[PDB]
């Protein structure tokens, strides 16, 4: 029922904060692959940003959105200021692990993965 | 008559009892605004009254401090300023009102 | 007796009187004052009285609770407001200590007190990093104890002890990669709690 | 009771005598030659060094070093598989698995310790009600692989057979304090 | 200053827990049964939430018990089924619930062991 | 846990005899050396009120003229039965804190002389075998003692619920433990209060108007160990 | 202790102190390894009568917090304790 | 005593041997298998039976401490001996 808000009154203002955050990220992205000698392309980086944004699309609560904005800002700080490293940024792509196949059979054959 | 407060960043106050009277009186002058049923007023008023009694009854600091039970008169003065600011912030807050919102009945229960 | 701890009632008296004092000055922002067997004074309050109460205790002439000994949080996941918040405060003019508690949850932040005590600048960051609790009007609020890309609040009661990821060096990419957690000896969960009641004084009713 | 450090009892004198003394201290570098003298004195003393492999540092009969599984004079083992060591070991380093032996006795089939998990706290030999597991005196058991530090019943029993002539004496020494 | 948001509550995107361990799971809410070895009942008083168990295999080197599920030793304690279920929903776990199996009241009569007509008469005192 | 072996107090006395001459050996080199005084004096100055509001404790308090020692105030052990002085400073600088730590090393010998001379006899752990284990002979001859040993080393002693904040005047300041208890063999929460935490927090203000080579001394004046900090 | 008078005097003059009485290397002044065996005392609760745990339990003498001003269930102004009494300069050595 | 298996591996005091078809025998290649050659199950059998003129006897293992908890054993069953569950010793009633 009724609640006490955080940094927003409605999902519209929340979404415009989100869009400001996306502006910031999208713009900064290439400076990272430049500063730290990442192998990936800016296209890959931007697709990854889009993926990590749409991962939290079903969200509806202005508060649950403001907190995600806060955390994304923390990450962007850690990134533009070179506190993270090649390792922490490449920990997004999972270059050294195969995923659980999204196939009942590919699961059954090897393990009890349900 | 004193070279050092014994502490750091506390300059000796060559003009004591005067800033004391001033600050205590300007505290009273804002406690007046507070309603009578306010415990903050009810209490701090008599606090300042006893302290004013002490300062106006003893001019010597070596015997005024031992009766105020505080530390050095500069620290008493710092506390008086803090109290004045606390009153100015109280008057804008509203502690003398009733409670805002009671909590669930299982909140301050220990153990659970 | 030689094996039991002494018991002085003067402190209980002083602290109950000061509890009444504080509570009748702030009938608002106050609830559940209590002084315990071991002579320690707790005051529970509403999240809207943090700065009021801290300022009162620090500046008020009778209180002079200047030092912020500690700031802490505590996770009890069986109550709607699960994150207890605790300020342990010290006064030297009286040689006294006090505890001020409030409550919070996820999505329901608390007000920062760096204006009152500047020590909190790091304690509040630690609380945010460990229990996941936001603070309003904090200049910098960011991971302090955890790694830079860590996703989680590990001092909760639902976050697993060993975590969700694990690090190792891989020659292919020449970096310290993260991966799921695969242990060679699963931590053993010893069920110790006894079936027989040990303290009747705390016996809950059915 | 308190004291003062870096506070003078009262102002000093600007007398020519004291001013010249301080000027001598400054120009002639007086307070430093005393440190030079301390270093020279230390040069002219005996160093506390010792030939390590030939001269060893002193220890006590309570030293907590390498582990050992003991026996009785008969030669029978002592561990009865009661698992108090496994239950008190803070680092969860002891793994035990027991069974009834063909002679009908409570004895282990598996007793493993991980020296890369042991914090060397002694709680296991504090708990053992039979004096079967003991943190012996040895400390010189480094290795080159991480797989030689995962001990087992056999390694620990061999260490017991090895060091019993010393463990027994140290226990005879100290058992009246515990 | 208050807003109204009546939609269901979810913090799944803040917990940091991943999809594999937030959707592929099954949680159980119950009261731990009394150990028939003992007659104490100070353990059947708080509800507990645990998870489904997963593979627990043998290390080739030493024979230890190895796993990959980091929520195998995760047990949570509650004072009320409503709070347990609210927490489960909040976090996003599919949960099964069991009821508190309370014992029945029993009629005991030390005199029944000595009756003149009944079968409750006992043959050894 | 155990009592003292029969040849320990004599050794401690032989050691206390000469530690003073050792401190003096060091003081000759360091305290009056103009280079030490230039590296330390007027460095990392901090006033008493700002120290308080920043949450400092110990030498960082009583090097600015404050009188706070949790052994003369809020005593916990028999410290109330022994005499020692508390050295306070006047300017709040690295030199004052150095001198404070030295005089503390001296008051420690003053306390050790008394502790040795006044060592009493008797047991060493509370004879409440539901908290502290029994001796091994009693364990191996008596039933109750063996049961208590078993329970203590498998499912240890149970602690009535509550909460505390016990502060110790550790060498680096107030060491605290907010310990929460449920009626269980294990705690529900243990929060450790370390001084290095607030000291590092205040490093930035203490390093105002200073070079790169004075920060390495500002740090040393706090005794920054990162185990108590990072925990 | 294995040094000549000339070196002893040299080091003592260079240091300002006397070292041959407060050395830091140990020469037979120390306790003897292989001490005799002890016989430890026994606590006060080692009686055989009048030793019931009901009297000396302790951890059951605890009681829940004494609650005050629960929100659901012309005094003077006091302090949490009498103000702290200031300390006295030492007598042995109050300066340095 | 250690008696070897077809594969050439020594058996332990708990009958452990890597099956000849087992790949885990690799770790022993160019190396050894640490095994204890003193089997308690035999060393205790080598001991003789104690005799007592009392139908109940207390065992501790030797020293009061340094042994094991004092346990009391019954010797009414002349058919067999009375064994200690701690030390393995066995007694008779004469
Ligand atoms: C592999 C070699 C390669 C070839 C390189 C060329 C060779 C160069 C020669 C150097 C030889 C050094 C080798 C020394 C070990 C030889 C074996 C031996 O003598 O056993 C030690 C044995 C000592 O046994 P100890 O039980 O340890 O007793 C030591 C004293 O108590 C403690 O002694 P102390 O500290 O009390 O002093 C005793 C005395 C010892 O004599 C010297 O040190 C003279 C040093 C030369 C003066 C320049 O010195 C003095 O104090 C009096 C003279 C003052 C000299 C003034 C110096 C400035 C102040 O005998 C010696 O000490 C004699 C060695 C003297 C060094 C001779 C070199 C000149
Ligand atoms: C005919 C009558 C009139 C004739 C005219 C001549 C009359 C005599 C004039 C007097 C001459 C005085 C000596 C000249 C050098 C003096 C230099 C000096 O004084 O340096 C000052 C400086 C410290 O200055 P300051 O920081 O202000 O002092 C602290 C304030 N409380 O001090 C320093 O910082 C020095 C730093 C020294 C650090 C290294 C010290 C190593 C010492 C090793 C021993 C060296 C001995 C000499 C070796 C000779 C080489 C063969
Ligand atoms: S000494 Fe090592 S093995 Fe023994 S209880 Fe302590 S940590 Fe565990
Ligand atoms: S405590 Fe001693 S007897 Fe019990 S399992 Fe451990 S080693 Fe064996
Ligand atoms: Zn036996």
UniProtKB/Swiss-Prot annotation, chain A:
Pfam families: Complex1_LYR_2. It comes from the Eukaryota. One of its GO terms (biological process) is mitochondrial respiratory chain complex I assembly. It is found in: Mitochondrion inner membrane. Transmembrane segments: none annotated. InterPro entries: Complex1_LYR_NDUFA6_LYRM6, NADH_Ub_cplx-1_asu_su-6. Keywords: Electron transport, Membrane, Mitochondrion, Mitochondrion inner membrane, Respiratory chain, Transport. Signal peptide: none annotated. One of its GO terms (cellular component) is respiratory chain complex I. It is a peripheral membrane protein. Belongs to the complex I LYR family. Mammalian complex I is composed of 45 different subunits. Accessory subunit of the mitochondrial membrane respiratory chain NADH dehydrogenase (Complex I), that is believed to be not involved in catalysis. Required for proper complex I assembly. Complex I functions in the transfer of electrons from NADH to the respiratory chain. The immediate electron acceptor for the enzyme is believed to be ubiquinone. This is NADH dehydrogenase [ubiquinone] 1 alpha subcomplex subunit 6. It comes from Mus musculus (Mouse).
UniProtKB/Swiss-Prot annotation, chain D:
GO terms for cellular component: mitochondrial inner membrane; mitochondrion; respiratory chain complex I. It is found in: Mitochondrion inner membrane. Signal peptide: none annotated. GO terms for biological process: aerobic respiration; mitochondrial electron transport, NADH to ubiquinone; mitochondrial respiratory chain complex I assembly; proton motive force-driven mitochondrial ATP synthesis. Its main location: mitochondrion. The keyword Iron applies. It is an enzyme of class 7 (translocase). Its cofactor is [4Fe-4S] cluster. Binds 2 [4Fe-4S] cluster. Its EC number is 7.1.1.2. [4Fe-4S] cluster 2 binds at residues 89, 118, 121, 124. Residues 70-99, 109-138 form the 4Fe-4S ferredoxin-type domain. This is NADH dehydrogenase [ubiquinone] iron-sulfur protein 8, mitochondrial. The gene is Ndufs8. The chain holds residues 35 to 212 of 212 of the full protein.
Swiss-Prot record, chain F:
Keywords: 4Fe-4S, Acetylation, Electron transport, Iron, Iron-sulfur, Membrane, Metal-binding, Methylation, Mitochondrion, Mitochondrion inner membrane, NAD, Oxidoreductase, Respiratory chain, Transit peptide, Translocase, Transport, Ubiquinone. Its main location: mitochondrion. It comes from the Eukaryota. GO terms for biological process: aerobic respiration; cellular response to oxygen levels; gliogenesis; mitochondrial electron transport, NADH to ubiquinone; mitochondrial respiratory chain complex I assembly; neural precursor cell proliferation; neurogenesis; proton motive force-driven mitochondrial ATP synthesis. One of its GO terms (cellular component) is mitochondrion. The keyword Transport applies. This is NADH dehydrogenase [ubiquinone] iron-sulfur protein 2, mitochondrial. It comes from Mus musculus (Mouse). The chain holds residues 233 to 463 of 463 of the full protein.
Swiss-Prot record, chain G:
It comes from the Eukaryota. The modification N-acetylalanine is found at residue 1. Residues 85-96 have a biased composition (Basic and acidic residues). Residues 74-96 are annotated as: Disordered. Transmembrane segments: none annotated. The modification N6-acetyllysine is found at residue 39. InterPro entries: NDUA7. Its main location: mitochondrion. The keyword Acetylation applies. Coiled coil: none annotated. Keywords: Acetylation, Electron transport, Membrane, Mitochondrion, Mitochondrion inner membrane, Phosphoprotein, Respiratory chain, Transport. GO terms for cellular component: mitochondrial inner membrane; mitochondrion; respiratory chain complex I. GO terms for biological process: aerobic respiration; ATP synthesis coupled electron transport; proton motive force-driven mitochondrial ATP synthesis. The keyword Repeat does not apply. The modification Phosphothreonine is found at residue 79. It is a peripheral membrane protein. It is found in: Mitochondrion inner membrane. Belongs to the complex I NDUFA7 subunit family. Accessory subunit of the mitochondrial membrane respiratory chain NADH dehydrogenase (Complex I), that is believed not to be involved in catalysis. Complex I functions in the transfer of electrons from NADH to the respiratory chain. The immediate electron acceptor for the enzyme is believed to be ubiquinone. Complex I is composed of 45 different subunits. This is NADH dehydrogenase [ubiquinone] 1 alpha subcomplex subunit 7. It comes from Mus musculus (Mouse).
């Amino acid at each position: 029922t009724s609640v006490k808000p955080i940094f927003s009154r409605d999902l519209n203002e929340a979404k415009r904060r989100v869009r400001e955050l996306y502006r910031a990220w999208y713009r900064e992205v290439p400076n990272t692959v430049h500063l730290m000698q990442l192998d990936i392309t800016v296209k890959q980086g931007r697709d990854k940003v889009r993926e990590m944004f749409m991962k939290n699309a079903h969200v509806t609560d202005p508060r649950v959105v403001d907190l995600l904005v806060i955390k994304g800002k923390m990450e962007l700080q850690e990134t533009i200021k070179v506190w993270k490293q090649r390792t922490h940024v490449m920990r997004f792509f999972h270059e050294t692990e195969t995923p659980r196949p999204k196939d009942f059979l590919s699961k059954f054959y090897m393990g009890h993965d349900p | 008559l004193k070279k050092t407060t014994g502490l750091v960043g506390l300059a000796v106050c060559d003009t004591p009892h005067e800033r004391l009277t001033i600050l205590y009186t300007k505290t009273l002058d804002i406690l007046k605004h507070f309603p009578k049923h306010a415990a903050y007023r009810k209490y701090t008023e008599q606090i300042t009254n006893e302290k004013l009694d002490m300062v106006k009854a003893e001019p010597d600091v070596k015997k005024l401090e031992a009766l105020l039970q505080g530390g050095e008169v500069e620290e008493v003065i710092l506390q008086a300023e803090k109290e004045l600011s606390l009153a100015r912030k109280m008057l804008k807050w509203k502690p003398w009102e009733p409670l805002v919102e009671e909590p669930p009945a299982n909140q301050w229960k220990w153990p659970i | 007796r030689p094996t039991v701890r002494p018991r002085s009632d003067v402190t209980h008296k002083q602290l109950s009187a000061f509890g009444e004092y504080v509570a009748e000055i702030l009938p608002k922002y106050v609830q559940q004052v209590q002084v315990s067997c071991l002579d320690e004074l707790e005051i529970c309050i509403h999240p809207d009285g943090v700065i009021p109460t801290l300022t009162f205790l620090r500046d008020h002439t009778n209180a002079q609770f200047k030092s912020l000994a500690d700031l802490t949080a505590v996770d009890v996941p069986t109550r709607q407001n699960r994150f207890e918040i605790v300020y342990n405060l010290l006064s030297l003019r009286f040689n006294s200590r006090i505890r001020v508690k409030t409550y919070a949850d996820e999505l329901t932040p608390i007000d920062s007190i760096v204006s009152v005590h500047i020590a909190a600048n790091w304690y509040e960051r630690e609380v945010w990093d460990m229990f996941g609790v936001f603070f309003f009007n904090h200049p910098d609020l960011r991971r302090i104890l955890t790694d830079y890309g860590f996703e989680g609040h590990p001092f909760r009661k639902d976050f697993p002890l060993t975590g969700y990821v694990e690090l190792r060096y891989d020659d292919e990419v020449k970096r310290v990669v993260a991966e799921p957690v695969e242990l060679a000896q699963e931590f053993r969960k010893f069920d110790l709690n006894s079936p027989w009641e040990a303290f009747p004084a705390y016996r809950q009713p059915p | 009771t308190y004291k003062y450090v870096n506070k003078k009892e009262q102002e000093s004198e600007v007398d020519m005598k004291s001013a010249t003394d301080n000027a001598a201290r400054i120009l002639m570098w007086t307070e430093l030659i005393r440190g030079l003298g301390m270093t020279l004195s230390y040069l002219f003393r005996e160093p506390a060094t010792i030939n390590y492999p030939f001269e060893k540092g002193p220890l006590s009969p309570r030293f907590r070093g390498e582990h050992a599984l003991r026996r009785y004079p008969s030669g029978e083992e002592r561990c009865i598989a009661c698992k108090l060591c496994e239950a008190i070991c803070p680092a969860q380093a002891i793994t035990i698995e027991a069974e009834p032996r063909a002679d009908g006795s409570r004895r282990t089939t598996r007793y493993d310790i991980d020296m890369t998990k042991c914090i060397y706290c002694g709680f296991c030999q504090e708990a053992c009600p039979v004096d079967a597991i003991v943190e012996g005196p040895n400390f010189e058991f480094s290795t080159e692989t991480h797989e030689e530090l995962l001990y087992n019943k056999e390694k620990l029993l061999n260490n017991g057979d090895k060091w019993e002539a010393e463990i027994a004496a140290n226990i005879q020494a100290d058992y009246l304090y515990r | 200053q208050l807003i109204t948001v009546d939609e269901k509550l979810d913090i799944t995107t803040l917990t940091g827990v991943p999809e594999e361990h937030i959707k592929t799971r099954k949680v159980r809410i119950f009261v731990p049964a009394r150990n028939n070895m003992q007659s104490g009942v100070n353990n059947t008083k708080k509800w507990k939430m645990e998870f489904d168990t997963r593979e627990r295999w043998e290390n080739p080197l030493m024979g230890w018990a190895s796993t990959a599920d980091p929520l195998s030793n995760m047990v949570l304690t509650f004072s009320a089924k409503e709070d347990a279920i609210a927490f489960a929903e909040k976090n996003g776990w599919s949960y099964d619930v069991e009821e508190k199996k309370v014992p029945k009241p029993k009629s005991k009569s030390y005199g029944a062991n000595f009756s003149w007509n009944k079968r409750t008469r006992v043959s050894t005192k | 846990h155990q009592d003292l072996p029969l040849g320990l107090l004599d050794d401690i006395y032989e050691f206390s005899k000469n530690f003073s001459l050792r401190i003096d050996e060091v003081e000759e080199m360091l305290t009056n050396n103009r280079i030490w005084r230039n590296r330390t004096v007027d460095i990392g100055v901090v006033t008493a009120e700002d120290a308080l509001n920043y949450g400092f404790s110990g030498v960082m308090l009583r090097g600015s003229g404050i009188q706070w020692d949790l052994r003369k105030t809020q005593p916990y052990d028999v410290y109330d039965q022994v005499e020692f002085d508390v050295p306070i400073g006047s300017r709040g600088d690295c030199y004052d804190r150095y001198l404070c730590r030295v005089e503390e090393m001296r008051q420690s010998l003053r306390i050790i002389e008394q502790c040795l001379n006044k060592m009493p006899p008797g047991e060493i752990k509370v004879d409440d075998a539901k908290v502290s284990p029994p001796k091994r002979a009693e364990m191996k001859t008596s039933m109750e003692s063996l049961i208590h040993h078993f329970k203590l080393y498998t499912e240890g002693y149970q602690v009535p619920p509550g909460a505390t904040y016990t502060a110790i005047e550790a060498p680096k300041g107030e060491f605290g433990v907010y310990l929460v208890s449920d009626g269980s063999s294990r705690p529900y929460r243990c929060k450790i209060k370390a001084p290095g935490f607030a000291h590092l927090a205040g490093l930035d203000k203490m390093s105002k108007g200073h070079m790169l080579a004075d920060v390495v001394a500002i740090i040393g004046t706090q005794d920054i160990v990162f185990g108590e900090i990072d925990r | 202790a294995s040094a000549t008078r000339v070196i002893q005097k040299l080091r003592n003059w260079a240091s300002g102190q006397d070292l041959q009485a407060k050395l830091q290397l140990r020469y037979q002044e120390i306790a003897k390894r292989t001490q005799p065996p002890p016989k430890l005392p026994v606590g006060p609760s080692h009686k055989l009568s009048n030793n019931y745990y009901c009297t000396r339990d302790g951890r059951r003498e605890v009681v829940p917090p004494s609650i005050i001003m629960s929100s659901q269930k012309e005094k003077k102004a006091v302090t949490p304790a009498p103000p702290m009494k200031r300390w006295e300069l030492s007598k042995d050595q109050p300066y340095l | 005593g250690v008696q070897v298996s077809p594969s050439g591996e020594k058996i332990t005091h708990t009958g452990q041997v890597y099956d000849e078809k087992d790949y885990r025998r690799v770790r022993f290649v160019d190396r050894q298998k640490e095994v204890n050659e003193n089997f308690a199950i035999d060393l205790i059998a080598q001991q003789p039976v104690n005799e007592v003129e009392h139908r109940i006897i207390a065992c501790d293992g030797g020293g009061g401490a340094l042994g094991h908890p004092k346990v009391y054993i019954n010797l009414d069953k002349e058919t067999k001996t009375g064994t200690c569950g701690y030390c393995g010793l066995q007694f008779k009633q004469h």
